[PDB]
Design a protein around this ligand. Sequence first.
Ligand SMILES: Nc1nc2c(ncn2[C@@H]2O[C@H](COP(=O)(O)OP(=O)(O)O)[C@@H](OP(=O)(O)O)[C@H]2O)c(=O)[nH]1
Length: 173
Amino acid sequence: GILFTRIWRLFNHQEHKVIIVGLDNAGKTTILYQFSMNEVVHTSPTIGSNVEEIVINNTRFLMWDIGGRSSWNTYYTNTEFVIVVVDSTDRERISVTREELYKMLAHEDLRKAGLLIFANKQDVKECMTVAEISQFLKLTSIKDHQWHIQACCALTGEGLCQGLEWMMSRLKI
Ligand SMILES: Nc1nc2c(ncn2[C@@H]2O[C@H](COP(=O)(O)OP(=O)(O)O)[C@@H](OP(=O)(O)O)[C@H]2O)c(=O)[nH]1
């Protein structure tokens, strides 16, 4: 909505580099699409294995599916935030997200990155609760990075304003 646009544009007064990952079908493309509305987008190829580069306004997003790589290490440096999109209805694969997440955080090049966990598809009945996702990903174990888990619905955009607001609060801090 218009409120997201106000906050998003404010955020883009500076340049940013964000990595957005998650298992296939977590809802990454849907979220980026929401971020793209009424903004300027520039996509470009990557010698990237299956990494897609999407620049929205002044924010460079590097997106890719986990759970399918040495090829990612080159992108970590200078990344301010790692956005992990989680399919809240997938109890079967939450362990995969967890395994991959911790394999990424071990890379010293992501030392200063903030971690935003979007618990997506929270609109779906019987989906895992945000508390459950935090528990199954053992987020409290993360003492060296700032993190925030956010309930969201990429279809409606609900939760995206809050997630973006967390990112803004973390930067000029
Ligand atoms: N209920 C529900 N669905 C969501 C949400 N977010 C994304 N989805 C749906 O999940 C599917 C995969 O999303 P997509 O953004 O392509 O995933 P990805 O890019 O991470 O692989 C899409 O369904 P289709 O492939 O059937 O079009 C999409 O509409 C959500 O918050 N709630």
